[PDB]
């Protein structure tokens, strides 16, 4: 079922790797300058580094079409407000520059980043309103949390037992952030236990999310995905809209840990890879150990949606 998109994608990557464009390996916007991604540098005094004082968002370009960029911009502006950050670049400026950098790079399948940091001033010495916040933009070749090869059979995960999710009353998980202390411990625990990915609990016997992805349990034809303690993922939104069209019931609510061990299918969903089936959990098969039919149908709907003119636009039909 992967050939549906990956045959065409592999052709586009071949063309990009053959390109002599100095931005084909990626492009960064830093202080009004476009720089090749691997030469791009930020000041070490940026509080985005010295206190991870930032928020970010990651839309994708697929076959030269941005997917749900307005949803990512909406969530980014919301995230900025929650942390009392104000982007020096307008929402409309960010959109214009992200499209320009995509065209300028020639990258047709892109992992895109918009970052706002506190700047050089910290919020102990200064009110947030007295801080001049920084904006960084990056466009790079599309990244896969789960690659084609792994998606064909599904990946492996564990419910972490050495680490639990940062609670929202400490750090708000609806505000996309790079304070991955728990997720990083999770990835190490997964490798220790011979699995690719962690699923973190809330420390109260419910599932939350993983290292850069939401979790969807499928049982008896119904989708179950955590409400609290997680990022409100754009991939999750897309997959649930596809589920609605196909007549699959879903609920965004508490997901008790027990349900992970009794379900038929598990999906991980994220911008960086899309729909990512999981067929091993804690060393045991998920259901029959096969990529399930509902996973396949949602995978197809998700990718088909990247041509939907209501949800996407082509990078050349765009005008500032």
Ligand X SMILES: Cc1ncc(COP(=O)(O)O)c(C=O)c1O
Whichever of 214 and 312 has its CB closer to its own copies, that residue is 214
Q: Which of 26, 141, 154, 233 binds ligand X (CB under 6 A)?
A: 233
Relative to beta strand 197-201, strand 155-159 is parallel
The contacts found for 148-153 with CB under 8 angstroms, 24 or more apart, are: 148/2, 148/6, 150/196, 150/276, 151/2, 151/273, 151/275, 151/276, 151/277, 151/291, 151/299, 152/2, 152/291, 153/279, 153/291
- Can you tell me the distance from the alpha carbon of 228 to that of 200, in angstroms, rounded to the nearest whole number? 13
Backbone torsions φ then ψ of 121, nearest 5 degrees: -100, 145
- 105 interacts with ligand X by CB under 6 A: no
Distance between CA 191 and CA 38 in Å, rounded? 28
Dihedral angle over CA of 246, 249, 250, 256, nearest 10 = -140
DSSP string, 73-113: HHHHHHHHHHTT---SS-HHHHHHHHHHHHHHHT-SSEEEE
Sequence-distant (≥ 6) Cβ neighbours of residue 79 within 8 angstroms: 55, 56, 57, 85, 174, 175, 176
Give the one entry of its own copies, Cl ion, ligand X, none that residue 271 binds, where binding means its C-beta sits below a cut-off of 5 to 8 angstroms depending on kind. Answer: ligand X
- Compute the least distance from the CB of residue 129 to its own copies, in Å: 10
The reply to whether 17 sits near Cl ion by the rule CB under 5 A is no
x/- letters, 280..309, toward Cl ion (CB under 5 A): ------------------------------
The reply to whether 43 sits near its own copies by the rule CB under 8 A is yes
Residue 18 token pair: 């053959």
Closest to its own copies by CB, 66 or 197: 197
Distance CA 59, CA 90 (A): 17
The Cα–Cα gap between 162 and 229 comes to 18
234 binds ligand X (CB under 6 A): yes
Closest CB to Cl ion among residues 148, 254: 254
Query: In the complex with ligand X, which residue's Cβ is closer, 23 or 111?
Result: 111
Q: What, of Cl ion, ligand X, its own copies, none, does residue 23 touch, CB below 5 to 8 Å by kind? A: none
Q: In this structure, is the dihedral angle defined by the CA atoms of residues 308, 212, 101 and 133, taken in order, positive or negative?
A: positive
Supply the minimum distance, in Å, between the C-beta of residue 250 and its own copies: 27
Q: Which of 182, 235, 242, 306 binds its own copies (CB under 8 A)?
A: 182
| Contact between 254 and Cl ion per CB under 5 A | yes
Residue 214 lies near ligand X (rule: CB under 6 A): yes
Total chain residues near ligand X (CB under 6 A): 14
By CB under 8 A, name the one of 27, 48, 260, 280 that touches its own copies.
48
Return the one option of Cl ion, its own copies, ligand X, none that residue 169 interacts with (CB less than 5 to 8 A, by type). its own copies
Which residues of the chain form contacts with ligand X (CB under 6 A)?
A: 58, 209, 212-214, 231, 233-236, 269-272
Which parts of this chain interact with its own copies (CB under 8 A)? 28, 30, 37-38, 40-45, 48-53, 83-84, 123-124, 127-128, 136, 138, 145, 163-167, 169-172, 177-185, 187-188, 191, 203, 211-212
Residues that bind Cl ion (CB under 5 A): 227, 253-254
């Amino acid at each position: 079922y992967t050939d549906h998109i990956f045959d065409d994608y592999r052709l586009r990557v071949k063309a990009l790797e053959a390109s002599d464009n100095p931005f084909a390996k990626g492009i960064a916007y830093i202080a009004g300058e476009y720089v090749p991604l691997h030469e791009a540098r930020i000041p070490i005094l940026d509080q985005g580094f010295l206190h991870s004082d930032l928020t970010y968002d990651v839309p994708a370009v697929w076959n030269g079409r941005f997917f749900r960029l307005e949803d990512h911009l909406d969530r980014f502006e919301k995230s900025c407000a929650q942390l009392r950050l104000k982007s020096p670049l307008s929402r409309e400026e960010i959109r214009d520059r992200l499209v320009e950098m995509t065209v300028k790079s020639g990258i047709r399948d892109a992992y895109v980043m918009m970052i706002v940091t506190r700047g050089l001033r910290f919020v102990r010495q200064y009110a947030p309103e007295e801080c001049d916040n920084f904006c960084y933009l990056m466009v790079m070749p599309y990244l896969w949390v789960m690659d084609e090869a792994t998606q064909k059979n599904g990946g492996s995960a564990v419910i972490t037992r050495t680490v639990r999710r940062v609670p929202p009353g400490a750090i708000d998980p609806t505000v996309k952030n790079l304070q991955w202390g728990d997720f990083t411990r999770g990835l190490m625990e997964a490798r220790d236990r011979g699995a690719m990915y962690p699923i973190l609990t809330d420390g109260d016997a419910n599932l939350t999310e993983g290292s850069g992805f939401n979790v969807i349990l499928i049982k008896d034809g119904k989708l179950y995905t955590p409400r609290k303690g997680v990022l409100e993922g754009v991939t999750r939104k897309s997959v649930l809209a596809v589920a609605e069209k196909l007549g699959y019931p879903y609920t965004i609510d508490d997901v008790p840990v027990e349900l992970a061990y009794q379900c038929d299918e598990i999906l991980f969903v994220t911008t960086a890879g899309g729909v990512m089936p999981i067929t091993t959990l804690d060393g045991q098969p998920v259901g029959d150990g096969q990529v399930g039919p509902i996973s396949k149908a949602l995978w197809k709907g998700y990718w088909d949606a990247h041509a939907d003119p209501e949800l996407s636009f082509a990078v050349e039909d765009y005008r500032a």
